[PDB]
């Protein structure tokens, strides 16, 4: 699009970035991050799927480790979500720890099967374990 950048709000930064012409996607690599709020969505690599509106209909993330962080309080700066792969509803602000998952905050962490990330006074309570790879 034309220059408008006095009105930006989201920022991604990448060391290797690629469009995906024959399939509409955009794919990013090299310790990449997308920022807007306390949701510290870094990875190595990000696959942004998008439609006719340039609307980013869903995003997939991966790295070594696979995880993102979040800032919840000035002391509770340390919350995070990890899993076998990560997929993100940019359509509603909710991240999903795909297949098998781990979720951590100060004083608590929970792990097991696939789960959607929480930002309220409620947990997932489902329990198990999963290997690294």
């Amino acid at each position: 699009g034309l220059p408008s950048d006095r009105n930006q709000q989201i920022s991604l930064v990448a060391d290797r970035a690629t469009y995906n012409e024959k399939t509409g996607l955009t794919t990013y690599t090299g310790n990449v991050v997308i920022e807007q709020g306390t949701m510290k969505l870094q990875a190595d690599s990000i696959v942004a799927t998008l439609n006719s509106k340039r609307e980013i209909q869903t995003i997939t993330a991966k790295g070594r480790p696979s995880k993102f962080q979040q800032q919840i309080s000035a002391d509770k700066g340390i919350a995070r979500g990890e899993g076998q792969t990560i997929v993100y509803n940019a359509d509603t602000g909710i991240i999903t720890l795909s297949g098998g998952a781990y979720l951590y905050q100060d004083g608590s962490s929970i792990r097991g099967n696939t789960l959607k990330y929480s930002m309220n006074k409620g947990d997932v309570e489902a329990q198990g374990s999963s290997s690294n790879r």
Partner: peptide, 16 residues
Amino acid sequence: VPITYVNRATXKCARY
């Protein structure tokens, strides 16, 4: 609200 696509390797930026 809009997206900034800023580059390492180059110190430049992009949009959609």
